[PDB]
């Protein structure tokens, strides 16, 4: 996260770290959506241009964390994966369309003050809140600048951007399964996700029921926090029928 701040304790209790077993290193962010399901970006698990194709036994999830590098004894919980599910129409070949994946845990995680699931949006919460200028919140342990890494989880609040501005900021083909967020050059304020924040959540707090909803997944960008560029996020509601099909079936 570029130009963010340290998270408060328990601020993002659905935060998940995807962790490589060997060598031991951070791979991505992710989010807790129930006691046994974690949501992330497909490119965290599968990206053939970079020879990335992880199996379940390659990975762990670490839940309840604040410090990036510490083993947070008596606070974090470490879970093994039963199964990875990648969207069948995830487009790693072109533009990261449908950049979404689910991971089922081998055993349910116990909730605590530090471990709690985020909600997924219904159609009406999504329609109400996915509007240009409305702000969401992105969290992660990724890079602090484009070109280094934080002691603790970082947080930044960023406005959703009008779709024509998103489209006109890039040569990549933008789809309805994406949205973009960030400040415009003339707005002064700054901030962005960055490499290492992949897979983490873009959340909004509903003013109707005062619950946090995950509207996006950190997906891609061109550099980090560049003027005139915006961060791109997987549109969770647009892909929710797939999420529900996987959870119902498996």
């Amino acid at each position: 996260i570029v130009e963010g701040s340290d998270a408060e304790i328990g601020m993002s209790p659905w935060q998940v770290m995807l962790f490589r077993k060997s060598p031991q290193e951070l791979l991505c962010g992710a989010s807790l959506i129930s006691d046994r399901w974690v949501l992330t970006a497909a490119h965290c698990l599968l990206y053939p241009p970079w020879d990335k194709n992880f199996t379940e036994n390659d990975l762990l999830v670490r839940i309840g964390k604040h410090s990036r590098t510490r083993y947070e004894r008596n606070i974090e919980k470490i879970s093994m994966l039963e199964k990875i599910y990648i969207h069948p129409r995830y487009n790693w070949r072109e533009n990261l369309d449908r950049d979404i994946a689910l991971m089922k845990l081998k055993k349910p995680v116990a909730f605590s003050d530090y471990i709690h699931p985020v909600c997924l949006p219904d159609r009406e919460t999504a329609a109400s809140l996915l509007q240009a200028g409305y702000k969401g919140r992105v969290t992660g342990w990724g890079n602090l600048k484009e070109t280094g890494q934080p002691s603790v989880l970082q947080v930044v609040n960023l406005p959703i951007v009008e779709r024509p501005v998103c489209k006109d900021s890039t040569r990549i083909r933008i789809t309805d399964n994406m949205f973009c967020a960030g400040y415009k050059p003339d707005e002064g304020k700054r901030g962005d996700a960055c490499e290492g924040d992949s897979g983490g959540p873009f959340v909004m707090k509903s003013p109707f029921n005062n619950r946090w909803y995950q509207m996006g997944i950190v997906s891609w960008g061109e550099g980090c926090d560049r003027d005139g560029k915006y961060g791109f996020y997987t549109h969770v509601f647009r892909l929710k029928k797939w999420i529900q099909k996987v959870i119902d079936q498996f």
């Binding site: 129930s34 006691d35 699931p117 997924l120 702000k135 005062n210 619950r211 909803y213």
Partner: peptide, 29 residues
């Protein structure tokens, strides 16, 4: 835990506000 989703133990559950959530609310115009 769908029923209880999105309500943080250290914030909403105890009616405490984090330091920047108001910025989100003020944007929902």
């Amino acid at each position: 835990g769908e029923a209880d989703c999105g309500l943080r133990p250290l914030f909403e559950k105890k009616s405490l506000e984090d330091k920047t959530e108001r910025e989100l609310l003020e944007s929902y115009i």
